[PDB]
Amino acid sequence: KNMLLGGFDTGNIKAKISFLNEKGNIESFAIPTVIAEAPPAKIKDEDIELLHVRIISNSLDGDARSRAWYVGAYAKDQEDRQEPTVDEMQKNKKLHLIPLFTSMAVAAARIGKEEVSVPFSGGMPEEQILEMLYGEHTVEFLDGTYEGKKIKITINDGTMNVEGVSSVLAILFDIVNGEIVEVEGGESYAINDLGAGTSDNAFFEDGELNKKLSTNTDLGTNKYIDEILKNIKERFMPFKTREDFIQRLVMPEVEKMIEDDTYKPTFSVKWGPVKENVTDIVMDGMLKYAEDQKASLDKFWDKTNADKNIVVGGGVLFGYAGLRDLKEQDGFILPKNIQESAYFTSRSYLIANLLEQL
Ligand SMILES: Nc1ncnc2c1ncn2[C@@H]1O[C@H](COP(=O)(O)OP(=O)(O)O)[C@@H](O)[C@H]1O
Ligand SMILES: [Mg+2]
Numbered sequence: 001k002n003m004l005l006g007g008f009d010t011g012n013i014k015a016k017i018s019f020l021n022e023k024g025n026i027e028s029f030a031i032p033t034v035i036a037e038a039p040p041a042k043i044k045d046e047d048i049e050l051l052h053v054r055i056i057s058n059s060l061d062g063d064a065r066s067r068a069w070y071v072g073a074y075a076k077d078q079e080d081r082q083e084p085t086v087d088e089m090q091k092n093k094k095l096h097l098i099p100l101f102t103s104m105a106v107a108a109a110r111i112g113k114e115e116v117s118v119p120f121s122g123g124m125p126e127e128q129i130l131e132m133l134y135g136e137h138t139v140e141f142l143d144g145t146y147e148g149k150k151i152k153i154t155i156n157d158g159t160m161n162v163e164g165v166s167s168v169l170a171i172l173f174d175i176v177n178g179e180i181v182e183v184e185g186g187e188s189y190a191i192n193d194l195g196a197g198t199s200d201n202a203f204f205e206d207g208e209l210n211k212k213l214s215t216n217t218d219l220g221t222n223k224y225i226d227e228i229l230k231n232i233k234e235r236f237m238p239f240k241t242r243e244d245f246i247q248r249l250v251m252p253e254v255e256k257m258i259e260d261d262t263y264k265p266t267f268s269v270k271w272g273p274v275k276e277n278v279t280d281i282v283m284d285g286m287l288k289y290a291e292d293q294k295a296s297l298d299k300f301w302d303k304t305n306a307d308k309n310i311v312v313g314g315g316v317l318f319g320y321a322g323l324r325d326l327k328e329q330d331g332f333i334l335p336k337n338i339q340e341s342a343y344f345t346s347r348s349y350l351i352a353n354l355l356e357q358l
Helices: 094-110 164-171 222-236 242-258 279-304 313-318 320-328 344-356
Strands: 006-010 014-020 026-032 036-038 053-054 064-069 115-116 135-141 150-157 188-196 200-206 215-216 268-271 276-278 308-312
Touching: 006 094, 006 344, 014 344, 026 094, 036 094, 053 094, 064 094, 094 135, 094 150, 115 308, 164 188, 164 200, 164 308, 164 344, 188 279, 188 313, 200 279, 222 242, 222 268, 222 276, 222 279, 242 313, 242 320, 276 308, 279 308, 279 313, 279 320, 313 320
Parallel strands: 115 150, 188 308
Antiparallel strands: 006 014, 014 026, 036 064, 053 064, 053 135, 135 150, 188 200, 200 215, 268 276
16 A cells, blocks of 8 residues: 556657556546746646646756656646657657656545555566666645645556567456456457557567567657648638647547447537538548558558457547448457547556556
8 A cells, every 4th residue: 555556658749647546446647748947836637737846856867856847738838848859750858757757646646645656567669767767756746736745756666568468458458446357358469559649560479579570650640630720720711739629629529429330420610700610621631540540550460460450549539430440350459448549558557567466
């Protein structure tokens, strides 16, 4: 006890966590990989909307030893903001450490604990990276829902879930108080994690990750989202972030499509004194993404000739209109609790973590 049980899925867009709440169920959220330097003091998922925290950790160095930061969404609106840099084709570690530690703190505050030991269950694209996380980290909230709260994080042990079925555990198992099998259900399989800026095409063969064939591409949803937003604004001539677009406009329609196959979705945007029906625009981009993913998945199927192909990530949901065809394809496996497809990997790491502590 006094222990936070979580799976940690960190990328360049978001830092994702799936953890056990007080009622023993899985709780998931994400913190954008964005930080900004902040003054020592104050100036669904509401508690992460304003993250102004002080972090004391030996995993940080230089003029970041022990100071205050704006983290995630609230950092994105700062001129100072630091984001992952990408060429036209470490020691930026605080970009990843800070949102990571922050997510641990937020989770701890959610379950009402001030001091948590956190066995690290994550993944990488081992011990060298784990030792970068070892030690004691204090996170103090200077604003927001948990203002004045001080959380002491202790990371003694961990794993990066490299080999075995650890990465795929969420395809078969859930945690409802703990620890049950999924309501519906080979030796060589591919896990395709369809993400925002990336697509992870991993191939597991005989209990082993095939490090040769396991590839990673920039085939994400963001480019297709960008295009849709270009055509919407152009249709008028609205949304602050892509997440805003996904949350306010897309997610409600996708959920309706999930829980009822006869439902045809509608997309209308209210901008100024004008309201436009842009259903055709959004659907075009969705299917374009689906078709492109269909093509990408097939040629990876052929390259590995895996027995089964598992498709996960938020891309499954964003392109559900087209990608739901995979449910009637033998050799393709969509998660059955498809509503939780975005947090598949972090949920897998969480389940692997609970099994470790048993
Ligand atoms: N329920 C949903 N409906 C529609 N789109 C979603 C849903 N959940 C996530 N997405 C979208 O799917 C894309 C992939 O998200 P995700 O896999 O979480 O990215 P990453 O793992 O790279 O951070 C994102 O653009 C996200 O906005
Ligand atoms: Mg991801």
